[PDB]
Each structure stands twice: as structure tokens, then as C-alpha cells.
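Repro case for the chain-ordering regression, as requested:
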Amino acid sequence: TTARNLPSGKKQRIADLLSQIIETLDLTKTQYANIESAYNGVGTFLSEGDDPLLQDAVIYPQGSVRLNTTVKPKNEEQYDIDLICYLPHATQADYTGVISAIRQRLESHKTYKTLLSELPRGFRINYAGDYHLDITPGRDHTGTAHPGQPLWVVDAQTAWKESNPSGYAEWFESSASVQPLRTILVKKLLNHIVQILKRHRDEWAAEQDEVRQRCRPISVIITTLACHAYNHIIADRRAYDNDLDILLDVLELMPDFIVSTQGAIHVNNPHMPEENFAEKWNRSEQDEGPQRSEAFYQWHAAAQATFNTIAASVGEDNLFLSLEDSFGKTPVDVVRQRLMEHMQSAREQGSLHLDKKTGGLIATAGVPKNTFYG
Amino acid sequence: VVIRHHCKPLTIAQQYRALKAGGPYERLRIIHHDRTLLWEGWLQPSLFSRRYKVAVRYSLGTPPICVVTEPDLFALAGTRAIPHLYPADKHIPGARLCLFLPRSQADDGLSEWRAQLKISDTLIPWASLWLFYFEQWLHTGHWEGGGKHPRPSEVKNER
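-- result from build under test --
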């Protein structure tokens, strides 16, 4: 049994199950306010310094935090939050000046001094048990026009490389805003799709070996591929009512977006050209790069196969087993517990009706009080 | 419910018509010269759940019995003994299921199922709801439903 051939009701049930599973993976708004206040206080501390170079530092979110695609790490208590300082006065400032200016002051503050841990590409603050802050110093870039964010960041090899974070965020927000056409019957959706795919990749990578784990797909490549695929299916005006078929179609259209040019594979930022997210794929020291392009294709095949198996499920016991196998045991337990509580209340409320055709249970002829000896 | 006691068990005719309206039935018979009625069909608990064949018979003055003929409850449901694979009164080859509290335990004197209620109105939903917890047991390992069960010293059985 294939996923596409199923009736729309079963397929809607599958979509609801996946969405409810992902709902527990996301972080709440109270925590988000906590992180926001934390790095806002860090930036306010930074502004207070007498150091001229560090002055006018600005802190804004990036990555999974900016694009509203946070999925809680499996077996890890600490979330990952990444931030970048902006220095308008450091257009020509050196690495040493900015790094020392940040470091000595982070050591100066009573609260931040102990939690500070250095990183090769920046600085980190270790709030214990709940989340982290990741800081990367960067100078401004002039010469090329964009929505406004051409910027350099810090890497040991070249000390400055181009990156354009904000433009990607605006592009994703504009793209995910549009809703596909819906047939007439008698968090954005793209964000949920990317979150489901990231959860699937996270649980899939564990069973693989060391080489596949180290070469597993990264979040930004999958995000931009899914965004391009979603954009074309929006432009293609194709009617979409089959739920996980949207994942199947998007994941079908992702591998076509990988571009090979003169032996170099470029998956680019649509706004800023010169930075390849697939720059790891291109370089091939000891076949490290080629193995990375493989893992995406095996993940493509596995993700296409998993909904075939879940579609092949018969019985309510095997469906839960398949969802536990593909989407983690711990998220699945809560969904089943909530379903059982809901239908137990429906028994108590009296809203459990009988379907005329199949006699199936309806959870919303109220079933009278009954006792079942095991 | 405060009602007159003049109400008596209805004739077979009233529930003869009732079961026909709801769902498909392969057979519906009158046997033993208007004594017993038989019903068969297919019942599905959930949307992804299996397909179950159910047989029900009744006689005036006797409690109904419900038996799931096909399937065999998924090969007896992997040993254990709870899904009540029972002799089933020796005329239908299938597991006989308990659906209501017997009159003896009820102190008020009114059973959960009485002759006033029809067969399709309550007994069929009771069987479907029983099958739902039956299939859920295979995953959970515990009867996450009505947990009523006596011990052989404390047991009192009507069957």
C-alpha cells in the first residue's frame, strides 16, 4: 500500500498525528521571552562599555531562532540559540580588537564571567540546564546591494567570510505566508513541514554509523530546498488537498534544486550569491564532501519510504508502533495518552456516538454506562 | 428514572426492524418459531482498525450474548487470556464477550442492559467499544478501560 492511494480521512489523521507530535518538540513563548531578555541584557551590558570599537553593538537572533523552526534536541536538556553582534564602527577593525573587547568585558561582569566558555568561532554563555547563547562578532560589508545585511563573520582560516542572515529570514517569512489553493467542498505550514523533516532526520541519523552521522544533512540546506520546492508548488497553482503528499511532493522536488556547475555544487542563498551552504559538499578531501551529498539522497529515499510503511499500517496497535519507530517514543506517548483521556471524558460526558455505517466510535447516540471485565 | 413499571419486555417484532436500519447485515433470521433472532455483520472500531464479524442472539426472558466470530481476535491475541476466548454456549465458534454488569451485583435492581432497551442501540456500541480497548491492550499492556475484575474467592458470575 502506497501513501498516495489512501482515502483522505486516513491521510488527514496521519497529518494530525505528525503535527501533534511536533507540537511537543517546539519551545513555548515564555521560554522565548526568557532568551530574548537574556541576550538583550547582554547587549545592553555591551553598550555600557567605555571601549570605542565595541560601541553600538546590536544583538539580533539567527538560525532556528529567527525562522521559528525550533525542535527540542533529543536526549539533550539544553536548547541552541545563536546570536551575532553588529558593529557599525568596526568596518576596518581587526580580529584581536573585537575579540578582546568582548572577552575581557564578558569576564568583567559578575553574572556572565563564570558561565563564559570560549569557542573557535566565537563566545558562548552557559546558562545551566535550560538553554545557551551563541555569539559571533561581525563587521559590515559594503559594495553590493541587498534588503540590507551584507556582513562578514569570523573564521580562523580567512578571518572574514560573507554571510547575509536577515535577507534569508525575510525571504522565508514572505514565502511561507502564502497558502496553497484549496478545493471547494460541499506557525506557518512550511515551518511545520521543515520541523517534521528535521525531526525525522534527527531520529534517522542515530542509527547510522560514524561517517553518516558526521556527514548528516544540515538544517539550512534542507530549509532552503524545502522553501524553493514550496515556492514552485505555489507558483504551479497545483491543487493540494492530500496532506503528506505535500511532504512527498516537496521532498521529491528538493533533489532537483541541487545545482552542479563545473564540478562544483552550489546551493546558494537566493539573496546573497557568494556563500555556498554546500561548500562542505564541494570540497573532497578524503571523500569527506562526496559522502555528504550521499546522506541527503539516502535520507530522501528513507523519508519517501516511511510514509509508505505508515500507510501500510493496519490496526491501531501497528500505527502507534510505526509512529514510535519513525518519530520517537516519548513524543508518541503523550499523544496516545491525550487521545485516551479525551475518549474517556467522552464516555463520561456522553458524546460517544455510534456511526451508522461501520459502528465506529465517534469522539466529540451517547453510549450508556457500562463495565467491561477483562 | 421514575417511570411506570407497567412496561414489560417487548415483542420480537420491535427489535426485528431496528437492527436493519443501522449498518449492513449479511443475515437476520427468525429461528425456533419466533423464539430467537440472529444478527451478523462487520464492525470496525477505528479508522485504521481491523475488520470484525459480530453475531448476536436473543430470547425473551434470557440475557443476550455477543460473540466475535471472525477474526479469531488476531490469533487469540498472542496467548494471555483476557479477550475471553470462551466455549460460547456451544453453538457459535467464537470468543464470547461480556458487555454489561449482571443484575446480581446491581443493588438498585436495574441492570445496565434491560429488555426495555433494544439490541442495536447499546449492545453493538458496547461491543465496538470493547474491541477498541482490546486492540489498545496489545500496545499498552494494560486494560486502560473499566478495570472491574473479581478474584475467585470474591467472584460472582452470571453467564
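Ordering looks correct now. The helical segments of chain B are 12-21, 73-77, 123-140.
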